[PDB]
């Protein structure tokens, strides 16, 4: 990644959109925000990574076509080399470092072993490569308990999301019995926490390509690997904002739930639907709380409720470090995109369904340094606990 840059471009009108589409047809562009040229809406900004050999051609294109831009990251190599800046020295698990899959997997076994009265672990299925997909149930044992479901690591490169699910579990077990809200939460409900969904992809970001997003499944008739798991669910599947080309980063897959990982998640949720009252899915970056719908311009029946809940959660998050989040329906932040898990869960009857996009706002983008894990998780905890308390009181 030596000499690679990440650009941000201001798009005003449809002319700017088709210009970016033409640029992306001329050079290989890795869209960071949103996920593809096809998800770009008028009056927004767009972030994308450019290869070293393409920097001058891209800059020339932006300048001569009068697209206003800035360089977010001047040398991606420098940012990548600076990501591992944790002051915690150890080769084992740390909640303040990014942990590889072998380490996270060992952590799921250990944290469960150490806290059997608060945590149980199951494997809800296996990935394309045969890795167990672990799910942790966090709560004091009891009958007929409602549940909140939270997943992290849909997208391989969004490392802060995987880190957050681990932090959440730590907070649940260490504050139970000591902080009144968490104590009430674990007594009355369970959290189902899926710390990494896209395990094969996550491994790939550690071993071969830090910028990988998709699953690692094969596709018929092409060398292009993987499906976008957040375009693989049965929600207006593959009708908008995605791609039928396996070589695209938003490939919807060969069918809804074609991926072992997404099928395992959808099966678990269907099998547990009477219990699950909220669905929370954790991503990065851009500091947003989004709710349905993304697949269509239509609004959910309880739009006013979801908007108010999102507003309150965003305000609660800001109380800690002043971090600013935006919020709203998915289809107001990007061009409509089909096949999302938050939309799917909502259409199953789960009335509280939210996507969280964590820090930052583009300074480091996906490559958030370890030194920000703690503050990111701390403030995010406030929003999650706020949503939990709301859900508990609105059963």
- The residues that are catalytic are 357
Residue 157 CB, shortest distance to Zn ion, in Å, is 9
Residue 366 CB, shortest distance to Zn ion, in Å, is 9
Whether residue 306 has a cis bond before it, omega within 30° of 0: no
Residue 291 CB, shortest distance to Zn ion, in Å, is 15
The stretch near Zn ion (CB under 5 A) out of 42-50, 103-111, 257-265, 276-284 is 276-284
Question: Which residues share a beta bridge with 15?
Answer: none
Q: Is 230 annotated as a binding residue?
A: yes
Residue 283 CB, shortest distance to Zn ion, in Å, is 3
Q: Where are the alpha helices (DSSP H) in 27-100?
A: 55-64, 76-82
The residue (of 39 and 94) whose beta carbon lies closer to Zn ion is 39
**Residues of span 125-154 touching Zn ion by CB under 5 A:** none
The stretch near Zn ion (CB under 5 A) out of 19-27, 84-92, 119-127, 277-285 is 277-285
| CA-to-CA dists, residue 209 to 73, 76, 202, 272, angstroms | 18, 13, 10, 35
Q: Binding to Zn ion by residue 97, rule CB under 5 A? A: no
Size of site (CB under 5 A) for Zn ion: 3
Q: Binding to Zn ion by residue 283, rule CB under 5 A? A: yes
Backbone angles phi, psi at 226, to 5 degrees: 95, 155
Residue 355 CB, shortest distance to Zn ion, in Å, is 8
Sign of CA dihedral 367, 193, 155, 99: positive
Rounded Cα distance between 268 and 235, Å, is 17
Query: Which residue's CB atom is positioned nearest to Zn ion?
Result: 283
Whether residue 34 has a cis bond before it, omega within 30° of 0: yes
Helix (H, G, I), strand (E, B) or coil at 283: strand
The stretch near Zn ion (CB under 5 A) out of 164-172, 234-242, 275-283, 305-313 is 275-283
Q: Where are the alpha helices (DSSP H) in 219-367?
A: 260-271, 303-321, 341-347
Question: Which residues share a beta bridge with 281?
Answer: 151, 355
Are 371 and 363 contacting, i.e. CB atoms less than 8 angstroms apart? Answer: no
Alpha-carbon torsion, ordered 166, 102, 201, 364, to 10 deg: 50
Q: Is 77 annotated as a binding residue?
A: no
Question: Which residues share a beta bridge with 149?
Answer: 192, 279
Q: Is 284 annotated as a binding residue?
A: yes
The residue (of 214 and 283) whose beta carbon lies closer to Zn ion is 283
Q: Is 158 annotated as a binding residue?
A: yes
Residue 228 CB, shortest distance to Zn ion, in Å, is 9
Q: Is 155 annotated as a binding residue?
A: yes
Q: Is 157 annotated as a binding residue?
A: yes
Q: What is the DSSP string of 180-221?
A: HHHHHHHHH-EEEEES-S-HHHHHHHHHT-TT--S-----TT
Q: Binding to Zn ion by residue 216, rule CB under 5 A? A: no
Q: Which of 49, 155, 214, 277 binds Zn ion (CB under 5 A)?
A: 155
List of residues contacting Zn ion (CB under 5 A): 155, 158, 283
Residue positions forming the annotated binding site for Zn(2+): 155, 158, 283
Annotated binding residues, written as ranges, equal 155-158, 213, 230-231, 283-285, 335
């Amino acid at each position: 990644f030596e000499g690679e840059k990440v650009f941000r471009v201001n798009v005003e009108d449809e002319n700017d959109i088709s210009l970016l589409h033409e640029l992306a047809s001329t050079r290989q562009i890795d869209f960071w925000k949103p996920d593809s040229v096809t998800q770009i809406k008028p009056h927004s900004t767009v972030d994308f990574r450019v290869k070293a050999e393409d920097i001058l051609a891209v800059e020339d294109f932006l300048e001569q076509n009068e697209l206003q831009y800035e360089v977010l990251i001047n040398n991606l190599r420098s940012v990548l080399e600076a990501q591992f800046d944790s002051r915690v020295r150890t080769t084992g698990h740390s909640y303040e470092k990014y942990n590889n899959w072998e380490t996270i997997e060992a952590w799921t076994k250990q944290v469960t072993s150490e806290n059997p009265d608060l945590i149980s672990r199951t494997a809800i299925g296996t990935t394309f490569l045969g890795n167990n997909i672990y799910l942790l149930k966090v709560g004091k044992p009891g009958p007929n308990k409602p549940a909140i479901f939270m997943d992290c690591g849909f997208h391989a490169r969004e490392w802060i999301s995987h880190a957050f699910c681990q932090w959440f579990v730590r907070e649940a077990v260490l504050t139970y019995g000591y902080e009144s809200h968490m104590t009430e939460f674990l007594n009355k409900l369970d959290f189902y926490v899926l710390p990494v969904l896209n395990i094969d992809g996550y491994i790939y970001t550690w071993t071969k390509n830090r910028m990988w997003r998709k699953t690692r499944s094969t596709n018929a008739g092409t060398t292009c690997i993987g499906t976008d798991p957040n375009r693989n669910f049965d929600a207006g599947w593959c009708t908008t904002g995605a791609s039928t080309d396996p070589c695209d980063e938003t490939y919807c897959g060969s069918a809804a739930e074609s991926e072992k990982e997404t099928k395992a998640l959808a099966d678990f949720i269907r099998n547990n639907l009477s219990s699950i009252k909220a669905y929370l899915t954790i991503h990065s970056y851009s500091q947003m709380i989004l709710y349905p719908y993304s697949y269509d311009y239509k609004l959910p029946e309880n739009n006013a409720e979801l908007n108010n809940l999102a507003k309150a959660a965003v305000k609660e998050l800001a109380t800690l470090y002043g971090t600013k989040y935006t919020y709203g329906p998915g289809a107001t932040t990007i061009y409509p995109a089909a096949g999302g898990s938050d939309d799917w869960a909502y259409d199953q009857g789960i009335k509280y369904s939210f996507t969280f996009e964590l820090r930052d706002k583009g300074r480091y983008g996906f490559i958030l340094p370890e030194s920000q894990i703690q503050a990111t998780c701390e403030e995010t905890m406030l929003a999650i606990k706020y949503v939990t308390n709301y859900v508990l009181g609105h059963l």
